[PDB]
Design an enzyme around this catalytic site. Structure first.
Site, PDB file in Angstrom:
ATOM      1  N   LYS A   1      -4.662  -9.797  -7.228  1.00 11.52           N
ATOM      2  CA  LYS A   1      -5.502  -9.306  -6.144  1.00 11.52           C
ATOM      3  C   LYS A   1      -6.607  -8.563  -6.885  1.00 11.52           C
ATOM      4  O   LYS A   1      -6.332  -7.876  -7.863  1.00 11.52           O
ATOM      5  CB  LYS A   1      -4.700  -8.370  -5.253  1.00 11.52           C
TER       6      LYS A   1
ATOM      7  N   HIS B   1       0.716  -1.270   0.000  1.00 10.67           N
ATOM      8  CA  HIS B   1       0.000   0.000   0.000  1.00 10.67           C
ATOM      9  C   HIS B   1       0.742   1.317   0.000  1.00 10.67           C
ATOM     10  O   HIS B   1       0.109   2.342   0.184  1.00 10.67           O
ATOM     11  CB  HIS B   1      -0.943   0.017   1.199  1.00 10.67           C
TER      12      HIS B   1
ATOM     13  N   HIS C   1      -2.538  -2.615   8.151  1.00 12.99           N
ATOM     14  CA  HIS C   1      -3.717  -3.026   7.391  1.00 12.99           C
ATOM     15  C   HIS C   1      -4.426  -1.827   6.773  1.00 12.99           C
ATOM     16  O   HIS C   1      -4.643  -0.825   7.432  1.00 12.99           O
ATOM     17  CB  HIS C   1      -4.713  -3.736   8.311  1.00 12.99           C
TER      18      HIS C   1
END
EC number: 3.1.27.-
Length: 122
Positions: free
Chosen positions: A39, A12, A113
């Site tokens: 993904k 990310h 996350h």
């Protein structure tokens, strides 16, 4: 360990992208090992890393829903949406650039996350 933090950064974080078009997504999704399987949706945050880490402190984050954190500051981001069926290579992606706050989960003071639902759009 900070393996989930460094892993968060791998999936990310992209400091200074050049173009945030379809090709950028396809290229970076491969480089970050997110293409086997493909993904379906993945979002990259751009900018200075100190700002993202800051999301876990008070100076740039608020509690969110259940045990999540939403940043006070907005970040440039690029969401890569898989296009085509197959979960295996070649992975075709459509990029959407954006600018807003992000939702993360923090652990030991570090982002580990990224909540994709806020960028989630078919």
């Amino acid at each position: 360990d900070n393996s989930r933090y460094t892993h968060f950064l791998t999936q990310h974080y992209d400091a200074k992208p050049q173009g945030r078009d379809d090709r950028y997504c396809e290229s970076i999704m491969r480089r970050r090992g997110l293409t086997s399987p493909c993904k379906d949706i993945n979002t990259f945050i751009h900018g200075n890393k100190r700002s993202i880490k800051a999301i876990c402190e008070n100076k740039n984050g608020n509690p969110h829903r259940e045990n999540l954190r939403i940043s006070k500051s907005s970040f440039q981001v690029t969401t890569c949406k898989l296009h085509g069926g197959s979960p295996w290579p070649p992975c075709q992606y459509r990029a959407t650039a954006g600018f807003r706050n992000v939702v993360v989960a923090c652990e030991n003071g570090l982002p580990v996350h990224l909540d994709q639902s806020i960028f989630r759009r078919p």
